[PDB]
């Protein structure tokens, strides 16, 4: 509704009629790098917060992990109104990822394919980025509680996939709200085959350990051991693909349930859309309105599965109040945005909050807390 917002939503109109969307997408990163990108600054309802465990999430909506893959940009796109984003995928050493263009987006059912292969700058550059935002989340107010996860995976060719991810942990824990386990992307060779069950747990359990040994190994009180917004070791989740058996899922369900796992991310982008005419040629991931009715049944899915004793954090075909109230009633307790942004903008997070509270008043919920689950 404001100008800000309002120029900045045709100039990105234009961009994504003419230009590339990696590039568009690296075009819009560096212009919230240098802090140009217009800010929410409305007080986000009280009836719409929401929490995972212990972590408290002032609004209901974040940016999904693969956005800002390096952390460059956290700063802006918190500001656009997010409570959250979930940086990443890192790996321990940077990786170019797959051969350029490799993401398309088909604006007529708003979808977009990737196979990016994990391109990022390595643990060590992005835990520098995300050293420099938490030190400047000390000095900007509008930065105070907002929530920031790091999604963590393994090298292509890696020796030890546990050990890529205690490398990561122990580079970058200490700045983590929350660590991402992401064995779902559809672009590494296996890894999605990290999903098998006994191989998970054990993936699981190595990664709370290696949390667990950061709290033990060094001589700070928490306040100053965890440089983070919760002071408090990161929780722990894992983001599951779509593309699984039902026995598969009931599987991992139990995984889930044995390990205590914190949360999980439902759900990563999915290889079985084939009516997408502009997506013919192509190889990847699916992501968009095309996998938003996929994601829903997977989130009704584990949450029965579960017993609905583990939280989910909603991936998937997001982009209206309505769709972020469906994900809340087949059970998530938080939405993660990203096609939303590329198809409709950086008034996103306003409009969808806004949407979400109509909403959730006209369906007569006096909180959002009240909505989880309800069939
Ligand atoms: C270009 C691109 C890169 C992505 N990279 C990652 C990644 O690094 N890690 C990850 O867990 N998911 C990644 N995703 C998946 C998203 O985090 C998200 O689950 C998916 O896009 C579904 O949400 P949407 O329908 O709102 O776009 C990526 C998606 C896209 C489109
Ligand atoms: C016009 C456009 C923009 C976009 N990325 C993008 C990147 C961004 F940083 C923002 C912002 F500023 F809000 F945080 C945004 F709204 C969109 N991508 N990303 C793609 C991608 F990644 F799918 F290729 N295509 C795009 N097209
Ligand atoms: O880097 C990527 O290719 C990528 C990772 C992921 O987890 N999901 C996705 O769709 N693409």
């Not at 935002?133 to 963590?152: M, P, T």
């Not at 350990?209 to 965890?226: G, R, S, T």
């Not at 993660?336 to 949407?355: D, P, T």
């Amino acid at each position: 509704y404001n100008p800000e917002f309002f120029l900045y939503d045709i100039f990105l109109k234009f961009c994504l009629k003419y230009i590339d969307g990696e590039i568009c997408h690296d075009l819009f990163l560096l212009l919230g790098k240098y802090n140009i990108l217009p800010y929410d600054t409305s007080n986000d309802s009280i009836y719409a917060c929401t929490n995972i465990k212990h972590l408290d999430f002032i609004n209901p909506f974040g940016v999904a992990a693969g956005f800002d893959k390096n952390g460059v940009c956290i700063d802006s796109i918190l500001k656009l109104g997010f409570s959250f984003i979930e940086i990443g995928t890192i790996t321990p050493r940077g990786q170019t990822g797959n051969a350029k263009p490799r993401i398309f987006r088909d604006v007529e059912s708003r979808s977009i394919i990737n196979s990016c292969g994990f391109n990022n700058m390595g643990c060590d550059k992005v835990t520098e980025n995300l050293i420099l935002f938490r030190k400047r989340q000390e000095e900007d107010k509008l930065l105070s509680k907002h929530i920031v996860g790091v999604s963590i995976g393994k090298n292509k060719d890696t020796v030890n996939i546990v050990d890529d991810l205690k490398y990561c942990i122990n580079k970058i824990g200490r700045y983590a709200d929350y660590i991402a386990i992401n064995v779902s992307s559809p672009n590494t060779p296996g890894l999605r085959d990290n999903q098998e069950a006994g191989k998970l747990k054990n993936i699981i359990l190595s990664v709370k350990e290696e949390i667990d040994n950061l709290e033990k190994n060094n001589i700070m009180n928490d306040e100053f051991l965890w440089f983070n917004t919760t002071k408090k070791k990161p929780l722990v989740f894992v983001k599951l693909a779509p593309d699984l058996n039902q026995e598969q899922k009931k599987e991992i369900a139990d995984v889930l349930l044995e390990t205590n796992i914190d949360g999980m991310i439902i759900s990563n982008t999915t290889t079985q859309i084939n009516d997408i005419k502009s997506f013919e040629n192509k190889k990847g991931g699916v992501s968009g309105a095309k996998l938003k009715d996929i994601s829903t049944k997977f989130i009704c899915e584990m949450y029965n599965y579960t017993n609905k004793q583990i939280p989910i954090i909603a991936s998937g075909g997001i982009f209206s109040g309505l769709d972020a109230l469906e994900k809340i009633e087949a059970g998530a307790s938080v939405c993660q945005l990203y096609s939303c942004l590329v198809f409709n903008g950086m008034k996103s997070a306003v409009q969808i909050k806004r949407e979400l509270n109509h909403l959730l008043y006209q369906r007569g919920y006096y909180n959002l807390k009240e909505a989880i689950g309800r069939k």
